[PDB]
Structure 1
């Protein structure tokens, strides 16, 4: 028995051990109470505005579109405190945890960005924060690990299984099943058991709300399409949510194609996966033929979630949103193009969304179209990764 529908069509649900269900129900109830509470909204809005930097700018990109009939805007989540959209929702979840009377935060992270976001939110609000991280990911992300420790977070390396996100996530859930009386589990994307897909969307929907008001002010019309990259799906659903009922607005999610879909090394479960049950939810996922969960691959570690949020699977199935893929090489080129012609260094994650926009513009250069790309993060974190690849190509 839940207050909210845990399913989006057939996708979603609460597929967790029985022991965890009191924790999810207590969370759903606190969320519903908080959503109706003007005091909660005013505190949340105050942190977003005076600490994180909202509202973010909507930047027109004339240089990139010259000689076409495409007008392109970037929603500048790279200007948010912390350098990525993740900040919006960790601040909401951290306030929610305080409202529930919790004093500890549990999180898991792969590339480290959700680790950093969880740690800065816990430092600000006086929460004790422990972060589980795969030992293979710990080695590869010493910058982000140091950041987390500077901010007072305990980083618990996990020496189990494949030492990747999966062991940590599973260790984080196990931790939470014992500690949920005092601790809140801060899930990092719009996936997982209900009510997390719903909560993470609602704490990201200001992205699309600001974008609607800002585009109406600057162009007097809604865009023809909004384009966002899709890992687990939080920045995309944050951009999409306020446009869902505006059926003339295309919604385009971009998954990583890796080296190519045909090669097998990619991260597009929504379009090349199979419905399964994992991580508390029923959703398209990448799995072997006898049902083991596969790792997704992408030059952008931030898009390596082996599934996708259930609301995206639902939007695809009814035809409200379209999901495409973009390869590593297409993403790097869009990265270089933005640096050179606008002076913005984008995250390699966000470069997938930009690359698809550049493709829509370049394939049909006389098509008149107003596009918005959600620039979900800045790419200072990717400077070394891009450099090594550009050197290995004699560039």
Structure 2
């Protein structure tokens, strides 16, 4: 039994080996206790404000919407310490780990961003952090690996399987099953077994809460729609959460279309995958007709999660949220457009969300609409990727 519902409709659950259930149950109870503890909330708020830099700005982009009836605001998570929204929830999970009396952190990472976030939170809060990363990703993300080590984290390369994220995830769990008494597994997105989808959403919901307060202050009304990219689903659910009961506000999640849905080389399991059971949850995923898990492709490494958070699959099923996809080229165009017109370099992940907002504006330029795009992170890290591509095309 559990204190909270592990499911969002048919999606979610706790599909892990029996040996890990005590760890999940312990975590759920600690979370429930922490959420009703004023002291925990005060400490979390203090770190978010004085260390991470919250609240983040809500920037109106007047140049990019010129000539149309679209008003666009960007929620600036790119201004958060670390350069991405990931920082919010790792701070919350780090505090939960300490609440449970743990002094060690286990984390998995693909593009290396969650690894860096986990490392910085652990350094700040005095936790011993060990990070599992696929050997392939370790070689492709030399910068992030060095950042993790600079912050005192132990980085462990994973060669098993395709030597990527999913393989790093499996290795992190194996470790945790035998060390959960003293170590907490800091999952990096709103997915995986309950209670993670719920915990990550709650530790990211300040994104939407601040956005609501800021948009009401600046426009005197709610957005017609809030748009966010969806890799695993944390920044999107963080933005969506506080607006779920505001039925007039559209919730639009953007999955990576890669080279195009029809090419099969994409990362859009929610709308183009098939429900399966993996990563400890029942959710849409990239898989063969046989049931073997595949990989998600995207120009943006941060959106390469072959599945998606269960709450997103649920919100989609009941029609509360709509999900679309944006290709590598559309994301690249949005990236270049924001740089040139607003002086902000967006993460390629976030560029997918912006690209869809630009499409909403351009396709119907006379449609009056107030949109908010969650700028999940900054794109200084993507400069080389964009440069090589542009050059490769002359």
Instruction: Give the TM-score of the pair, scaled to structure 2.
Output: 1.00
Question: Which whole-Å CA distance do the structure 2 matches of 1:177 and 1:64 have between them?
Answer: 50
Q: CA deviation at 1:158?
A: 1.3
Q: What is the rounded CA distance, in whole Å, between the counterparts of 2:165 and 2:68 in structure 1?
A: 42
Residue 301 of structure 2 corresponds to 301
Q: Secondary structure at the match of 1:107?
A: strand
Q: Report the equivalent of 1:133.
A: 133
- Which digits, 9 at most, give the CA deviation of each residue in 1:205-238, with x for residues without a partner? 0000000000000000100000000000000000
What is the CA deviation profile of residues 32-91 of structure 1, one whole-angstrom value per residue up to 9, with x for unaligned ones? Answer: 000000000000000000000000000000000000000000000000000000000000
State the shift of 1:168 in Å.
Answer: 1.3
List gaps (5 residues or longer) in structure 2. none
Tell me the matched-pair count: 394
Q: Which residue of structure 2 lines up, in the alignment, with residue 330 of structure 1?
A: 330
- SS of the aligned residue for 2:14 comes to strand
1:167 deviation in Å? 1.8
Task: For 1:377 and 1:262, locate their aligned partners in 2 and report how far apart those are by CA, in whole Å.
Answer: 28
Partner Cα separation in structure 2 for residue 199 and residue 49 of structure 1: 20
Give per-residue Cα distances to partners, 1:146-179, cap 9 Å, x unaligned. Answer: 0000000000111222111122111100000000
Q: Within 2, Cα distance between the matches of 1:7 and 1:148?
A: 34
DSSP 3-state at the match of 1:179: coil
Quick one: distance in 1 between partners of 2:41 and 2:116? 24
**SS in structure 2 at match of 1:293:** coil
Give the whole-Å Cα distance in 2 for the aligned partners of 1:168 and 1:10.
27
The SS at the match of 2:63 is helix
How far apart, in 2, do the equivalents of 1:104 and 1:64 lie? 45
How far apart are residue 124 of structure 1 and its match? Answer: 0.0
Q: Counterpart of 2:56 in 1: which secondary structure?
A: coil
Question: Offset at 1:117?
Answer: 0.1
Please list every run of 5 or more consecutive structure 1 residues that lacks an aligned counterpart in the other structure: none
2:255 match: 255
Q: 2:237, 2:159 → 1: CA distance? A: 33
Task: String of CA shifts for 1:242-280, please: whole Å, max 9, x gaps.
Answer: 000000000000000000000000000000011100010
| Deviation sequence 1:334-382 (CA, Å, 0-9, x none) | 0000000000000000000000000000000000000000000000000
Cα drift, residue 284 of structure 1: 0.5
- Match of 1:132, SS? strand
**In structure 1, how many angstroms separate the alpha carbons of the residues matched to 2:55 and 2:384?**
30
Task: Name the CA distance, whole Å, in 2 between partners of 1:61 and 1:33.
Answer: 41
Query: Following the alignment from structure 1 to structure 2, what is the Cα–Cα distance between the partners of residues 315 and 166?
Result: 24
SS state at 1:316 partner: helix
1:44-83 → structure 2 map (5 Å cutoff): 44-83=44-83
Distance 2:192 2:158 in 1: 20
Q: Secondary structure at the match of 1:55?
A: coil
- Following the alignment from structure 2 to structure 1, what is the Cα–Cα distance between the partners of residues 208 and 183? 31
Distance in structure 1 (CA, Å) of the matches to 2:26 and 2:186: 14
Runs of 4+ off more than 2 Å: none
Distance 1:372 1:162 in 2: 37
SS in 1 for 2:106: strand
Give the whole-Å Cα distance in 2 for the aligned partners of 1:168 and 1:378.
25
CA distance in structure 2 between the partners assigned to 1:162 and 1:326 by the alignment: 26
Aligned equivalents of 2:158 and 2:241: distance in 1? 36
- What is the alpha-carbon distance in structure 2 between the residues aligned to residue 355 and residue 31 of structure 1? 36
Per the TM alignment, residue 393 of structure 1 is displaced from its structure 2 partner at its CA by 1.0
SS in 2 for 1:333: helix
